[PDB]
Paper text:
The oxidase is shown to perform dehydrogenation of the thiazoline in the peptide intermediate while it is covalently attached to the NRPS, as the penultimate step in bacillamide D synthesis. The oxidase forms a stable complex with the NRPS and dimerizes it. We visualized co-complexes of the oxidase bound to the elongation module of the NRPS using X-ray crystallography and cryo-EM.
The complex of BmdBM2–BmdC was subjected to structural investigation by X-ray crystallography and cryo-electron microscopy. Furthermore, though both BmdB modules of the BmdBM2-BmdC complex are visible in EM maps, the highest quality map was obtained by performing refinement with a mask that enveloped the BmdC dimer and a single BmdBM2 protomer, because the modest flexibility of the Ox:A2 interface does break the overall twofold symmetry of the full complex. The EM maps do confirm the overall conformation and mode of dimerization observed by crystallography. There is some flexibility in this configuration, with the relative Ox:A2 orientation varying by ~11° across the three structures. There is clearly some flexibility visible in the EM dataset, so it is more straightforward to refine the region of the map consisting of a single BmdBM2 and a dimer of BmdC, but the BmdBM2 are in the same general orientation relative to BmdC.
Author numbering:
A (entry chain E): 847 to 1435, 1439 to 1677
B (entry chain D), C (entry chain A): 2 to 324
The structure:
């Protein structure tokens, strides 16, 4: 008649009663409704007799944080109301009111009964008993134990059953004595050693944050698995020497691992049937619930059954260390990993497979309704065996999920079970349906561009407008016909020294008009070029020429020193083909060369010039260094249009950049975001420029506020965001910025430009569901040919996908948004 | 081929305790130590290596710094001076009976202007002949007005632009005739036309030379740009709103060989004959025009690649009238 | 109370062995003993006695003769110089690639002129915009020709005479307006009209001042006369046949206080303006005009009693067209 300590789960039920904790404030509550032919006065008397036989039903929970069996209670009478005279619709109105009320109502602490029983007579021989209880009172095993004795007395009121000799208060005494040593200590050591690397719970594709939910609202996805399928699954488990529990957990794990893009995942597993304690304990009423966590690892190539066996061994060992509660573990874990009072383990698996009796309550009358709510749960996967029927029910908070995702996940679970029934193993989960079409059209970018070669584009434009000025630096400049004559002499010179197709020429990045002449000559003769910045530490300049195996370095002071003027300036015999390397650029110092062919380079240029209608009236400001791939667009992109290129002597002088645009009438800006941002801080409020029509911001992050400064100082310019790789032909992903278009923390990365594709892949290289974060890969015609003189890097970065063809892993992380674009989250 | 520099005729100098004063600046060092001999040599036209040979005899750096400063300060010059330098010395001869405030205070200036508009010649006798106002002037003259506001949306049509320019073309009537009188019949002033992007139909932005014999425009420069900072603030609205502009360039080589200094003078007059003729035609064509008192001509002369004998004497801004 | 003289800005001093050389002439005797200090001292503006005490201290007779010559030779001057003196030094900057024959052989001149009328600019690029010849100019411009012969018997009618002068009169439209532009809106050009006996109806012979504000001619001088010997002989027939002649005079006080030296330059432009305007009206009125580049202005400024601030810039001869 004394108070006793709570089990750790009961302690947790008490803690979870606190509204201050995430998704808490609800001590777990359970609702039941059953249909019988049996009279209430007799069931009511049987109910008090079970209280007399099973005094734990006479328990009260105290505000103290302890439990006590009451000396006694006011005798309980099941209230019975007759709905017999009511039409079925009104009978339902009363049944619905009691069900709704019992589901939302919570038992107060200090309330003597921890249960409530109300019943209706719908017909003289049709009854519906509606009831509820607080979880601190009892288990499900206990609920049917009670139902069995209750119905016994209905039929045989005088067939008096013995009292429990071993009572809950004796049960709890032993509990308090056990938690001192032996198995407690042994289990604690087992768990203590595992705890430091116990995995996190999987992260699901939630629609909403728990803070947006407050009180959870549960719905369900249910199905009954027929006896034949159930027996086939059991036989499979028998052949594989495993329990169906491991079989079910593994299938559940596949669904979760797929959707969350996880390799390892912690699963909240509920432990049933306590510790032995005494000879009569399975015969008494009380709460025998305990927590265990399941450490699952799905990062396997291995067969389904292998994963099941791994799961089985894990389950079996964990249950031998049940003597240390998972509640204690999680307390230690969340303090260990600084998780704070958060809903850390919201995904739970519960099983009554071979863990249920005849269902004494259904022997009394059929189950019509059941509902339960627990704190801090997003989804409870519960499987029950019912006289051979396999009952599967996923109880989930509707507020946290997109209903279509939720239906899809359940559907996949069931389909995996069906495959195990027919084949014995499963097909890896994959997604298509109302998702596949979005990606299918997203990547539908093919266009009829001939590519050809970079110098051919120059040659033809030079013939169309030979007296146009092509390159401007100071008061010195070159025309299109001059570039052809000068580059023809230089190319003959290079050819005459034995430099041919397949060779490489290093060139220096100097601000001289002759730099362009030398650059064109190298390509016209068929050699690829390698740019070097003259201000690189000297040892790096030497490193690159040696590492790249170049034959000669071309300085700018050559025309007058190598007697170039002695050479013919007439037409050259063509050498290069579209498939040849145009250039090799060294990046990411240690640095690797990136091999780019003429076709790839051309297609990017052709698409940009066509999309933005670039023409002979345009002016491009050459701010960017020649050591970048970015400069290819400026040089070749200008020449193919008949446009004018302006060189900048010193890119750091923002005032010079402003002076240049104003004095030269620049129409196209092409920089990394940092330059436009810096240039704009040397601009006063009175400043306005109407010469820029197009601004290309390429690479790096673009601040959401940046367009505001661009738009006010350059009110007529179109601001474009461009992403890509150097391991690809400069640009791959496009997005215009039409002001800040939404309340968001990011600018859409965008969509592919032309003849390019993009994918988001999971940890196993399969497509991620829309909204799921994974690795970013690029495919299509814009790819580089590999790294120069680094085979291991090429091997891992450039791969051949069985469905998508050659793709490049950029290694950036991100996801597709259902809106039709890629959002990226940086590299990590 | 070395550039010859002359003591600029616009500069005078004095000895002082501080140093030597040339124009508005005071100098010390070798330049002081040089005495009139420097002055006399600079006076006849000497190249730098010769001045160093004669006037160095000290550190080369010192000698070079002095000559560089004098060139920068326009003490030593290359050739013929522009009008702003030519008339500069007359400032020391004019004595202003008015306070300086007429150049700072709007009210002081308005007083000045109103008083001057009602002035007469002092040496007059007490008798006069009153003229009648009974006749008439044609609209082409009496209704002309300077415009400072333009239609920035409508481009000047090609035919309009051609017809306005035709006002200065050559005609052949057994000799070359113009639509206006000039010089001794030499017509020593070149016309350059500047067009802003898309403001004139059929013409690309840039600086063009007009050839009156052909009735055509030939591009000289389509790279550089004219900017608002090439104008004084009072005229920046005009700059921003105009469509095109016309520059009048005097060729010393076309006149000086026959008239000497007078040729420069006559060209200064001729510019106003041309200007009036052009404005009359512009009014028939609804083209607004406005004269500019001062502009950054040095930058423009650079853009047009004008030679040593060439100077811009006058410039006019314009476009279709705002309406 | 003495007149102030200034070292003329147009004269450059140098020393030689013979003596002091100023411009074109060499001075000898005591003047050599006056040094560079005379050159410096004179730049600030001096009286004759202040200058004499500083540099004489010996017989004043020699000092007075020297100073008198320097004044007569325009070394020491009292005020603003006329344009013939203002632009004189520019000839030392110009280099002439042509022979002197342009001034002596009419054939050398014709050749010269033909080259000049077919000149093009050196920087022209190989492009071309051909302009339309599809338009027309108003008759007032395209039918105008210089007149070198006049009706010597018919007096200019009064109305014609008055109507021509009216082209430069003031108008009031809530402010004072003219039919032509002026830099700064000051209109600093005074107009004097000279009429011969019995050649202009209603007007007695003499020199008159024209006041645009009154629209009238105020007599200035009916004693003196303009004679043929005041002109270069090439113009003596124009002078002999004309009825009247108009002089344009620049009034420095009407410009210099606002613009400084630039004001004189602007006035030189304005002289082309006005002239062209007048020419157009003369065409409507059937009046012939011919401008003159140079004549004896010193006698004229004496006759008109012009003050120190007044400079004669230009003159035009005319009369009725003869048929
Ligand atoms: C040589 C010259 C230069 C001038 N410069 C300017 C100038 O810089 N800015 C301006 O607004 N007006 C300028 N004007 C003043 C006006 O053009 C003009 O004299 C005024 O509008 C009065 O004449 P109107 O009624 O015919 O327009 C200039 C005029 C001349 C003759
Ligand atoms: C500033 C100036 C001064 C001139 N001086 C004289 C002159 O002294 N004698 C003369 O007969 N013509 C003189 N002329 C030349 C004629 O005025 C006229 O311009 C020339 O003959 C062109 O004739 P046209 O009417 O066939 O076009 C002068 C012209 C200008 C612009």
């Amino acid at each position: 008649s004394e108070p006793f300590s709570l089990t750790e789960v009961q302690t947790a039920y008490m803690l979870g009663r606190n509204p201050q904790f995430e998704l808490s404030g609800i001590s777990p509550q359970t609702y039941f409704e059953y249909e019988t032919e049996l009279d209430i006065a007799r069931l009511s008397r049987s109910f008090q007799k079970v209280i007399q036989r099973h005094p734990m039903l006479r328990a009260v929970i105290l505000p103290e944080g302890k439990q006590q069996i009451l000396r006694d209670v006011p005798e309980y009478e099941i209230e019975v109301e007759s709905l017999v005279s009511m039409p079925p619709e009104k009978q339902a109105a009363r049944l619905r009111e009691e069900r709704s009320r019992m589901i939302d109502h919570v038992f107060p602490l200090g309330q003597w009964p921890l249960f409530e029983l109300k019943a209706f007579q719908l017909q003289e021989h049709t009854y519906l008993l509606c009831f509820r209880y607080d979880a601190l009172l009892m288990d499900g095993a206990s609920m049917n134990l009670v139902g069995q004795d209750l119905m016994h007395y209905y039929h045989q009121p005088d067939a008096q059953l013995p009292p429990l000799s071993f009572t809950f208060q004796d049960y709890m005494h032993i509990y308090d004595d056990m938690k001192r040593g032996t198995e407690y200590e042994t289990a604690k050591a087992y768990w203590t050693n595992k705890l430091p690397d116990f995995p996190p719970a999987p992260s699901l594709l939630l629609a909403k944050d728990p803070a947006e939910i407050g009180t959870p609202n549960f719905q369900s996805l249910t199905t009954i698995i027929t006896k034949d399928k159930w027996l086939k699954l059991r036989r499979l488990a028998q052949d594989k020497q495993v329990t169906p529990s491991a079989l079910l957990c593994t299938v559940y794990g596949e669904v979760l691992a797929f959707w969350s893009n996880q390799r390892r995942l912690a699963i909240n597993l509920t432990v049933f049937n306590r510790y032995p304690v005494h000879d009569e304990v399975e015969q008494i009423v009380g709460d025998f619930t305990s927590l265990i966590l399941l450490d699952m690892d799905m990062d396997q190539k291995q067969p389904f059954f292998t994963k099941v066996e791994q799961t089985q061994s894990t389950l079996l060992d964990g249950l031998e260390h049940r003597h240390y509660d998972g509640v204690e573990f999680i307390r230690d874990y969340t303090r260990y990993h600084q998780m704070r009072p958060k809903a850390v383990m919201p995904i739970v698996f519960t099983s009554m497979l071979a863990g249920a009796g005849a269902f004494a309550w259904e022997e009394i009358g059929s189950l019509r309704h059941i509902h339960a709510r627990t704190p801090q749960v997003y989804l409870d996967n519960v499987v029950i065996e019912k006289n051979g029927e396999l009952l599967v029910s996923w109880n989930y908070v509707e507020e946290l999920f997109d209903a279509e995702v939720m239906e899809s996940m359940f559907t996949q679970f069931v389909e995996l079970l069906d495959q195990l029934v027919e084949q014995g193993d499963i097909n890896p989960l994959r997604i298509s349906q109302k998702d596949y079409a979005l990606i299918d059209q997203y990547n539908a970018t093919a266009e009829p561009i001939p590519a050809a070669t970079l110098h051919q584009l120059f040659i033809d434009q030079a013939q169309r407008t030979p007296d146009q000025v092509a390159v401007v630096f100071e008061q010195e400049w070159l025309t299109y016909s001059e570039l052809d004559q000068r580059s023809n002499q230089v190319a003959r010179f290079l050819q005459s020294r034995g430099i041919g197709r397949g060779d490489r020429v290093g060139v220096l990045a100097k601000r001289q008009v002759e730099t362009i002449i030398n650059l064109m000559a190298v390509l016209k003769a068929g050699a690829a070029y390698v740019p070097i910045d003259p201000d690189h530490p000297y040892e790096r300049q030497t490193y690159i020429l040696e590492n790249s195996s170049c034959k000669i370095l071309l300085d700018s002071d050559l025309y007058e020193t190598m007697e170039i003027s002695s050479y013919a300036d007439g037409d050259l015999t063509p050498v290069a083909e579209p498939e040849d390397t145009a250039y090799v650029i060294y990046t990411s110092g240690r640095p690797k060369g990136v091999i780019i062919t003429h076709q790839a380079a051309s297609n990017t240029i052709q698409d940009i010039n066509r999309k933005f209608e670039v023409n002979e009236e345009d002016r491009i400001i050459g701010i960017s260094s020649m050591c970048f791939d970015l400069s290819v667009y400026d040089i070749f992109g200008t020449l193919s249009a008949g446009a004018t290129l302006v060189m900048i002597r010193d890119p750091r002088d923002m005032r010079e950049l402003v002076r240049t645009v104003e004095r030269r009438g620049i129409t196209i800006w092409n920089t990394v975001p940092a330059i436009m941002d810096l240039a704009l801080d040397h601009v006063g409020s009175h400043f306005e420029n109407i010469s820029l029509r197009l601004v290309l911001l390429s690479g790096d992050w673009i601040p959401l506020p940046l367009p505001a400064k661009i738009n006010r100082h350059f009110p007529v310019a179109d601001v474009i965001s461009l992403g890509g790789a150097t391991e690809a032909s400069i640009w791959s992903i496009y997005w215009p910025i039409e002001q800040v278009e939404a309340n968001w923390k990011s600018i859409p990365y965008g969509k592919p430009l032309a003849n390019q594709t993009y994918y988001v892949l999971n940890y196993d290289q399969k497509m991620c569901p829309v909204g799921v974060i994974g690795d970013l890969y690029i495919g299509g015609a814009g790819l580089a040919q590999g790294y120069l003189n680094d085979d291991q890097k090429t091997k891992d970065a450039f791969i051949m996908h069985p469905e998508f063809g050659p793709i490049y892993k950029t290694g950036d992380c991100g996801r597709m948004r259902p809106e039709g674009y890629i959002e990226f989250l940086g590299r990590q | 081929g070395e550039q010859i520099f002359y003591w600029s005729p616009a500069k005078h100098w004095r000895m002082s305790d501080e140093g030597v004063v040339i124009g508005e600046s005071t100098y010390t060092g070798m330049i002081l130590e040089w005495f009139p001999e420097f002055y006399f040599f600079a006076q006849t036209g000497v190249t730098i290596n010769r001045l160093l040979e004669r006037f160095s005899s000290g550190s080369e750096k010192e000698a070079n710094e002095i000559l560089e400063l004098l060139i920068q300060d326009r003490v030593l010059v290359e050739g013929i001076l522009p009008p702003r330098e030519v008339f500069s010395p007359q400032e020391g001869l004019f004595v202003n009976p008015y306070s300086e405030q007429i150049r700072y205070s709007k009210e002081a200036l308005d007083y000045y202007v109103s008083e001057q508009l009602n002035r007469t010649h002092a040496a007059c006798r007490s008798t006069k002949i009153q003229l009648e106002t009974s006749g008439a002037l044609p609209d082409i003259i009496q209704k002309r007005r300077s415009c400072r506001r333009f239609d920035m949306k409508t481009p000047v049509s090609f035919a309009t632009f051609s017809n306005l320019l035709s006002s200065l073309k050559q005609r052949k009537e057994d000799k070359i005739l113009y639509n206006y009188a000039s010089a001794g019949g030499l017509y020593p002033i070149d016309v350059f036309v500047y067009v802003k992007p898309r403001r004139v139909e059929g013409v690309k932005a840039g600086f063009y030379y007009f050839n009156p014999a052909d009735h055509s425009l030939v591009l000289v420069n389509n790279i550089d740009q004219v900017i608002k900072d090439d104008h004084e603030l009072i005229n920046q609205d005009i700059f921003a709103q105009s469509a095109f502009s016309v520059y009048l360039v005097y060729n010393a080589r076309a006149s000086m060989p026959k008239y000497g200094a007078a040729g420069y003078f006559y060209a200064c007059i001729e510019a106003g004959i041309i200007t009036a003729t052009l404005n009359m035609v512009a009014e028939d064509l609804n083209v607004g025009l406005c004269s500019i008192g001062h502009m950054n001509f040095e930058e423009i002369q650079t853009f047009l690649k004008l030679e040593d004998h060439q100077v811009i004497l006058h410039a006019i801004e314009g476009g279709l009238k705002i309406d």
